Amino acid sequence: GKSYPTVSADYQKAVEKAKKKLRGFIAEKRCAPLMLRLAWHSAGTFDKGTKTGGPFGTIKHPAELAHSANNGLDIAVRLLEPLKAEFPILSYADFYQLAGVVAVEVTGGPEVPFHPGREDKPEPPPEGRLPDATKGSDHLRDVFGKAMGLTDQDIVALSGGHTIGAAHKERSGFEGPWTSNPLIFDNSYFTELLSGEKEGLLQLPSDKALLSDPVFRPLVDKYAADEDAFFADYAEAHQKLSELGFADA
Numbered sequence: 001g002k003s004y005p006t007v008s009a010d011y012q013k014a015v016e017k018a019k020k021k022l023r024g025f026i027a028e029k030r031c032a033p034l035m036l037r038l039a040w041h042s043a044g045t046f047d048k049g050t051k052t053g054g055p056f057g058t059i060k061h062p063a064e065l066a067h068s069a070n071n072g073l074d075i076a077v078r079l080l081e082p083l084k085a086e087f088p089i090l091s092y093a094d095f096y097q098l099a100g101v102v103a104v105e106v107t108g109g110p111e112v113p114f115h116p117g118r119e120d121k122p123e124p125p126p127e128g129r130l131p132d133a134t135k136g137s138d139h140l141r142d143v144f145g146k147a148m149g150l151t152d153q154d155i156v157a158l159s160g161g162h163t164i165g166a167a168h169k170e171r172s173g174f175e176g177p178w179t180s181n182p183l184i185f186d187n188s189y190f191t192e193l194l195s196g197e198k199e200g201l202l203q204l205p206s207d208k209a210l211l212s213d214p215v216f217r218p219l220v221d222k223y224a225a226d227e228d229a230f231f232a233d234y235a236e237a238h239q240k241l242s243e244l245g246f247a248d249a
């Protein structure tokens with residue numbers, strides 16, 4: 001249900017050049033997981049009932065970075081600022097969502113479609129919309145379904161973004177990677193989840209809640225067996241997330 005805005009040719013050219021610069025930078029700095037977390041926290045504050053929050057540039061504001069869920073993202077904002085400055089015509093909103101798409105691409109994931117045109121909005125959303133790692137399947141539906149308006153399939157696919165990166169005890173308090181290859185975007189998050197706890201590796205209570213719910217569990221089994229299907233459903237889910245409240249809700 002989307003109607004994308006028209007942007008000038010100069011805007012379009014800047015998008016294309018920024019994507020190339022972002023690839024090289026993100027690869028060099030080894031920070032893909034962090035950029036993916038930044039885009040996800042930027043978008044995941046959207047609430048469809050009030051049409052507030054979502055991917056509109058606000059995560060750079062000191063008021064939003066202080067949200068406790070956002071521990072560590074000040075690093076990500078700071079890292080990107082000198083590059084953003086080379087592209088003054090782009091909104092921060094677009095730039096951060098593009099960083100997220102590129103993070104998936106450069107770690108070997110699917111090519112998520114990207115449409116430009118998000119505007120930077122002045123008011124950050126209220127704290128507390130991002131999900132709690134200690135809660136379960138009901139909470140996940142409250143947040144992704146009721147607030148953001150995504151489907152159950154989207155919830156499972158997007159959880160698979162834990163295939164890259166790690167928790168840090170100084171940020172959330174949890175510690176460690178979910179997979180043994182945390183810079184490679186693949187389906188191993190789902191394979192580690194099935195085979196159970198392994199020393200070295202992390203499972204949140206919210207990751208485990210996927211294994212026990214009647215709807216989530218078949219999707220976990222599908223994605224553990226078929227990386228192609230995971231990549232397809234992931235690209236679809238990431239696109240929707242990156243576009244919440246944009247070009248029609």
Ligand code: HEM
Nearest residue numbers: 033036037040131132133158161165166167168171172206
């Ligand atoms: C499903 C509900 C989710 C919960 C409860 C959750 C929670 C967390 C927590 C607690 C961390 C550790 C932060 C730290 O200590 O540094 C984390 C990291 C991360 N999250 Fe999630 N998350 C969820 C969904 C998502 C989604 C939808 C995405 C993107 C598609 C995502 C991407 C990531 C990435 C890439 C990291 C690693 C960050 C790094 O390596 O610095 N997560 N998440």
